[PDB]
Amino acid sequence: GITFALASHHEICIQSISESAINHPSQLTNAFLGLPLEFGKCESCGATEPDKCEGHFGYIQLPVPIYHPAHVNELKQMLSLLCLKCLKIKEASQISIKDRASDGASYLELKLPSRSRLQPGCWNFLERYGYRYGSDYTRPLLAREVKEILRRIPEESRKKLTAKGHIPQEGYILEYLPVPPNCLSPSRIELKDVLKKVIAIKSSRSGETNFESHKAEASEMFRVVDTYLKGSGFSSRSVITGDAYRHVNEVGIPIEIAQRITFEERVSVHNRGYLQKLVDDKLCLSYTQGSTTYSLRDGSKGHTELKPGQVVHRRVMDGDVVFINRPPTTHKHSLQALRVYVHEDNTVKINPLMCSPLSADFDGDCVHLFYPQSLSAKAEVMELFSV
Amino acid sequence: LIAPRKCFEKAAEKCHTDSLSTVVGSCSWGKRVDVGTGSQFELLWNQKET
Amino acid sequence: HSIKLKHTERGIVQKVVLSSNDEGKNFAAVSLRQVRSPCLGDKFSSMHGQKGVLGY
Amino acid sequence: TNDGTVRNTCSNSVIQFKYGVDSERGHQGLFEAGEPVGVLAATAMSNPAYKAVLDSSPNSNSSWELMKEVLLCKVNFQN
Amino acid sequence: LPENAECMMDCEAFQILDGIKGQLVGLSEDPSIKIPVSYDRALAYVESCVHYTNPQSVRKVLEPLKTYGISDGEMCVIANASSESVDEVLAFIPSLKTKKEVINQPLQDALEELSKL
Amino acid sequence: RKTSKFMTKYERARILGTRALQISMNAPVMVELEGETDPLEIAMKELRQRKIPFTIRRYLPDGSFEEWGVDELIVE
Amino acid sequence: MFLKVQLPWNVMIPAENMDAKGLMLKRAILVELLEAFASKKATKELGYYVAVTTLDKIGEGKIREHTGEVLFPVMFSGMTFKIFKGEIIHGVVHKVLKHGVFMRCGPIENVYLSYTKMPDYKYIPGENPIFMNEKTSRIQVETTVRVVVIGIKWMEVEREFQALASLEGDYLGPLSEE
Amino acid sequence: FRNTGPVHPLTRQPVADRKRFGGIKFGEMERDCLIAHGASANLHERLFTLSDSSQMHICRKCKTYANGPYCRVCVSSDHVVRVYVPYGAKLLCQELFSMGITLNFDTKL
DNA sequence: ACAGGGAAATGGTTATGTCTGCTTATCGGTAGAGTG
RNA sequence: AUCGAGAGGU
DNA sequence: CACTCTACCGATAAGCAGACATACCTCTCGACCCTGT
Ligand SMILES: [Mg+2]
């Protein structure tokens, strides 16, 4: 069972195999992120085909603290649920918490009740843990204070948090921004804009975080919280007609469809001569040996020797089983296994006796006739889906 | 069924998931489906008669 | 880089017409003709609603 | 499951003790142990509704509506 | 290491590998199986480092040392050391400067056993 | 454990599939009925008898397992 | 030095050797264990595998899909080889160089012996690289030397253990037969 | 028709332009009918073999997705597991790691 | 005529029901404790 | 190659 | 032993925005703007 968790900055730093930070626009198309583009080279892995490219992540040095937008409720409840704890190592009963919606940003508010009187020396733990910025009712709570109060966790708090159903991680403050690989290539434009904003703000930093810096520590948060946050192989579809002069388990197939699609089967000892007399007359298309595939087109002057390790796919002939899929119908009876029949026309022959299990009239309906590939799938379709 | 972002973030903040064998994982992660031919029964080979 | 015919495209070239506009953009079109006779699977219809597929 | 009782994949919960009537009559039905029925009952309940509502039948409209009503009842409801 | 993990002594690999090389004739005579490359190397190593001939007598005479509070690691050390002098055991483990004055007697016992056998 | 002692169709399909896949991997047949064109017929004639080399191991929802040989089980 | 370890392994066995008599199946599975074990070199946590002596328990085999082969999970006990820090080991030297010698300690073939810690032996150039000291002692091929390991280093590309020896000391001499 | 050929550059699936080759998409009705019939082998076959197939790796000790394979904390890639995972789940975990949610793939083998 | 940043607005306001869910006023309903 | 829209057989 | 007076939990509506167009599959026909050197 897969388990979800939060991405802490240390985990992003460990996952990031590159040591250099991404600061320039041209660094997004470098070589250590795989080969999803049409032109370029790789330095990390070097898998030349796109089917082997998995992608490599990255990180951006971001020294500014940003709150997690969609996890403000989790922090709210985790801060409201804890009992009153004085000393975190190893008058505060009426404390309340609220939020302010300032330009879309969800900032936490530590507001005191109006019935209580304000005292400059109260909450000495907040004073020793951080400097009091706002001496009024509006106090901007910086994420550093939250990280500092949440860094040292006692045993009882750990037990109660593991019992309630949550767990705090070092990922609420985004310090290392994970950058997705180039497998995807407006998101790129927003990434470029936010990169320009963060580099401008970093160039506009001088000293510790004060009011003169907090006045410029706003647009970043607003830009963060404003806009920053299957097919199948085998297939066949054609018009179906009526044919009541054949068995119920027999269904027709055109020439080109039977010529294109094949049926995979492993080489056995009981059919040593049959496979040879089928492969010498050039009816098969290709054959796979180990991890490489060899075609059966014109150009081979050497005889195709039989080997149990070399798998072959035989063209569908009388003796193959297939199941069909109809327009959506509640009944599972619509899916059925029928033997294939060879003919010269291009349409499919369906007897009128199969109209009650299905729902397709001969008025122009379309079906989806599939092909089993594995021999286990062959047994499954011949035993379960059979009439 | 509904907007995937809210349920995904809820599962992320929950961080508690048990080992279950429903349709989830069998059709999205490649796990063997636990109904039909892939139900709870094994095929250990016996050496006594062979 | 040239346009290659896809699956259901085949025929005998019946007309090749080439032309340009005032903006200096050369155009060109090739028309391919196929003649067909009713074959199994082709839908027919009358003046009164009934509609069916040739089956034999 | 193999025990003959209807089991659930989550928390190993039991829904029914045996799938199949145990009256005086006896028939060897196609229902076996390792066979899913919840999906089968889902399709077999969605089929009749479809017909009743695809046709414009007003007699079947009342019948379909009652079935629709029983399929929308909720734990919390008001007036 | 598992619960049934014990360090092997000397000349047991000699005997076992001599048995394997005796079987090697029929093993190579059968074209179904190929000969490994590690057996002959290990047997050359054990013939270059063979010192004892009987495991049972040396085991029964060293068992009192196992009772004296000696584990099997240093047992293998003194077995593959052919230990007998005080300088040899000093150069083997330099951390015995404080306990040589009591460990000299097991060294004399080992010398006597090696001289007897 | 099981009083009915009836083989389900799903286990039958599984064992026929694995028997065909085994006989299709350069392995001789237990019965002397070689010469077929498809491995499905070989697997069917093999399961039609009682001599089957492998058996099935059922699982219990309580968290245990019970063995049941194919020799004592009967097939329809 | 040689440690007895019990470890589970999923051995692959085809079905062309399936017969009624069981001793043939036992010989087949044994020779398949041997041919599968004589293909790798060693491991990082366990060490050099030497051989297998006795089988403990036989386990029932499971079938694999898409390939038609049965896998036998068998519990067996085997012999391994591992060298530890500070464990003095006897080795024979084969190749001599300018900066050190290439001594052979059983299967390991990359035990490095640094020359900077060689106070008494001096290098003599010529066809045969040799080291001679005041005690009239030589270290060459077929000659065993007693060294003390000070460290071990692993290599993932060669699958070998790089051990560095030490020769500094007082009155160091070769072993004398009695 | 379709035996093999090009796929989608994003989802690694057969394209919708069925003029040449291509290939239809597996619908929910097909999966519903398959689970109703009680089939698991051919379902996984059509879901992995004929569809987008790939590979995945993680440390036995660590609980993160390892990109051959290398995890940085436990440098010893000697303890890795290779399990068959389709490309859809790979894109999903990639997108979740891009958003900021890590995945703990609990694997027995 | 092309590289680089991320903008460019025009006021306007009479024209799917029907619902689930989330967040605010409104109504009582207490429940004490100043008095008595 | 990509996106969106429109027109279709079920 | 009766009175009044405001702190606290409910029930309330009561207002507030959203949210939604079964599914398999076919074909053709156009797709960001203002400004500086
Ligand atoms: Mg119709």
Author numbering:
A (entry chain A): 16 to 105, 125 to 219, 234 to 277, 318 to 475
B (entry chain A): 1187 to 1236
C (entry chain B): 871 to 926
D (entry chain A): 792 to 870
E (entry chain D): 85 to 201
F (entry chain F): 59 to 134
G (entry chain G): 1 to 178
H (entry chain B): 1050 to 1116, 1130 to 1171
Paper text:
De novo DNA methylation in plants relies on transcription of RNA polymerase V (Pol V) along with KTF1, which produce long non-coding RNAs for recruitment and assembly of the DNA methylation machinery. Pol V transcription elongation complex functions as the assembly scaffold for targeted DNA methylation, and therefore plays a central role in RdDM pathway. KTF1 is a paralog of SPT5, the only universally conserved transcription elongation factor in all three domains of lives (NusG in bacteria and SPT5 in archaea and eukaryotes). Pol V is evolutionally derived from Pol II through gene duplication.
Here, we present the cryo-EM structure of Arabidopsis KTF1-bound transcription elongation complex of Pol V (KTF1-bound Pol V TEC). To assemble KTF1-SPT4-bound Pol V TEC, we reconstituted the complex using Arabidopsis thaliana Pol V core enzyme, the KTF1-SPT4 heterodimer, and a nucleic-acid scaffold comprising a pre-melted transcription bubble and a 30-nt RNA with 9-nt region complementary to the template DNA. The cryo-EM maps show strong signals for all 12 subunits of Pol V, 19-bp downstream DNA in the downstream dsDNA binding channel, 9-bp RNA-DNA hybrid in the active-site cleft, and 6-bp upstream dsDNA in the upstream dsDNA channel. Although the KTF1-SPT4 heterodimer was included in the complex reconstitution, the cryo-EM map only shows signal for the KOW5 domain of KTF1 bound near the RNA exit channel. The RNA-DNA hybrid of the transcription bubble in the active site cleft adopts the post-translocation state with the ‘i + 1’ site empty for binding of the incoming NTP. The bridge helix of Pol V-TEC adopts a straight conformation like that of Pol II, in sharp contrast to the bent conformation of Pol IV bridge helix that contains a two-residue deletion at the middle region. The clamp domain of Pol V exhibits disordered lid and rudder loops, and therefore loses interaction with the RNA-DNA hybrid. We infer that DNA binding is not able to induce clamp closure of Pol V due to the loss of above interactions, resulting in a wide-open DNA main cleft in the Pol V TEC structure. No cryo-EM map signal is observed for NGN domain of KTF1 and SPT4 near the upstream dsDNA channel, where SPT5-NGN and SPT4 locate in the Pol II TEC.The structure shows that KOW5 binds near the RNA exit channel, where it makes interactions with the C-terminal β strand of NRP(A/B/C/D/E)12 subunit, the wall (or flap) domain of the NRP(D/E)2 subunit, and zinc loop of NRP(B/D/E)3 subunit. KTF1-KOW5 domain interacts with Pol V mainly through polar interactions made by R615, R617, K622, Y624, R627, K639, S642, Q643, and H644.
